[PDB]
Amino acid sequence: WLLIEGHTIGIGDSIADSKTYQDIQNTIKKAKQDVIEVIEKAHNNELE
Amino acid sequence: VGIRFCQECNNMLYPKEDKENRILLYACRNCDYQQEADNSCIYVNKITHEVDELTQIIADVSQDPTLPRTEDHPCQKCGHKEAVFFQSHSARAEDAMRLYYVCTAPHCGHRWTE
Ligand SMILES: [Zn+2]
Ligand SMILES: [Zn+2]
Numbered sequence: 001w002l003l004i005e006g007h008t009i010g011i012g013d014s015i016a017d018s019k020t021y022q023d024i025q026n027t028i029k030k031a032k033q034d035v036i037e038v039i040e041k042a043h044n045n046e047l048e
Numbered sequence: 049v050g051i052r053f054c055q056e057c058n059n060m061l062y063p064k065e066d067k068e069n070r071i072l073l074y075a076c077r078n079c080d081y082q083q084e085a086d087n088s089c090i091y092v093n094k095i096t097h098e099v100d101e102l103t104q105i106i107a108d109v110s111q112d113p114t115l116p117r118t119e120d121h122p123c124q125k126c127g128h129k130e131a132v133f134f135q136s137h138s139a140r141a142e143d144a145m146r147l148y149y150v151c152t153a154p155h156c157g158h159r160w161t162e
Contacts, residue, residue, distance in 0.1 A: 042145045044162075 049092055056081045063090050101136055101148065107157030109134070110150050121149055124160060128153035 041047050052061050054076040061074035061083060072085040109115065115132040122129050133147045151158050 043147045045144075045146055047145075 049087070049089065052083070054079065054081050055083075101138070101141075102159045102161060104138075105148060105150065105159050107150065107159070110152035110157065117152060121162065123151035123153060123156060123158055125158045126151065126153050126156050128156060 038047075052074060053059065054061055056079050057076065059076055059078050061081075062077055063072055063085065064075050066073045072088055072090075073082050074085050075082040110132055112132070115134055117130055117132045119129050121131055121133075123131055128151050130153070131149050131151045133149050135145055135147065137148075146161060149160050149162065
């Protein structure tokens with residue numbers, strides 16, 4: 001039956017849309033900003 | 049706490065008892081020289097070994113291209129805006145990520161911590 005149906009993998013499976021791309025980029029930016037804030041807290045001796 | 053040497057053969061002086069005048073003295077083990085002890089303490093160790101690392105920072109590190117430098121913290125003596133910063137930068141330095149600041153100005157080298 002797989003001869004009739006078919007199965008594959010390609011670029012279109014690994015790609016996503018621009019809304020999801022911008023969401024991912026926003027999450028990465030927020031994470032980097034949080035790490036910068038934690039670094040600032042550590043350097044200012046404000047880390048408990 | 050310090051080590052003082054003999055003035056005759058330049059060997060190490062050792063503390064010893066003066067049993068009649070009841071005073072600590074330093075005497076050489078290789079001759080007969082004796083010297084009165086002013087500090088009146090011999091051995092001391094700090095187990096927690098807290099030391100200011102600002103004394104261990106050479107002022108030459110302002111010429112390092114690899115160290116980061118900031119503009120927000122100015123120097124205290126010359127008021128120079130640019131200054132490099134770095135961490136404790138040593139092993140057995142307990143747990144602290146405290147920054148040490150060195151002014152990167154010519155004929156300067158004031159060191160402060162925040
Ligand atoms: Zn001697
Ligand atoms: Zn300065």
